[PDB]
Design a protein around this ligand. Structure first.
Ligand code: ZN
Length: 140
């Protein structure tokens, strides 16, 4: 589990969204596994605005932050997981690393802020849903 809290936005994995998320929807995209809902309280996370390919992600199933290199956001074929069939997922970045279903929502961060959240795992790869292209999270 995990979310990003920026401005009056809450960013979560679409497969972990709550009724309150859907009842306060801003934007959602199944192909990216992302959903954004509106918040009453201001959040303090900064979204990275950059093309970094190195950062650190949180792996809840190891209670550890791991430094990783990660790929550019792309359309990646993902094997079946407990929450999606095998499919193409968009805006996805991969690294070599550990990722269980419970690790979804862990933050990937670089020197510029939050890059994305854990979304996929298996075959010794961890996939992160990028948020750096969602420039509107920074305003309004
Ligand atoms: Zn960066």
């Amino acid at each position: 589990s995990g979310a990003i809290y920026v401005g009056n936005y809450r960013v979560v994995n679409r497969h972990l969204a709550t009724h309150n998320d859907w009842a306060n929807l801003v934007w959602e995209d199944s192909s990216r596994d992302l959903l954004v809902s509106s918040t009453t309280a201001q959040g303090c996370d900064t979204i990275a605005r950059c093309d970094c390919q190195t950062g650190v992600y949180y792996c809840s199933s190891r209670r550890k932050h791991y430094p990783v290199s990660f790929s550019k956001p792309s359309l990646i074929f993902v094997e079946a997981s407990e929450y999606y069939p095998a499919r193409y997922q968009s805006h996805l970045m991969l690294a070599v690393g550990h990722s269980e279903p419970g690790d979804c929502g862990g933050i990937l961060r670089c020197q510029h802020g939050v890059v994305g959240i854990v979304s996929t795992g298996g075959n010794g790869l961890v996939g992160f849903a990028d948020v750096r292209d969602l420039l509107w999270l920074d305003e309004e």
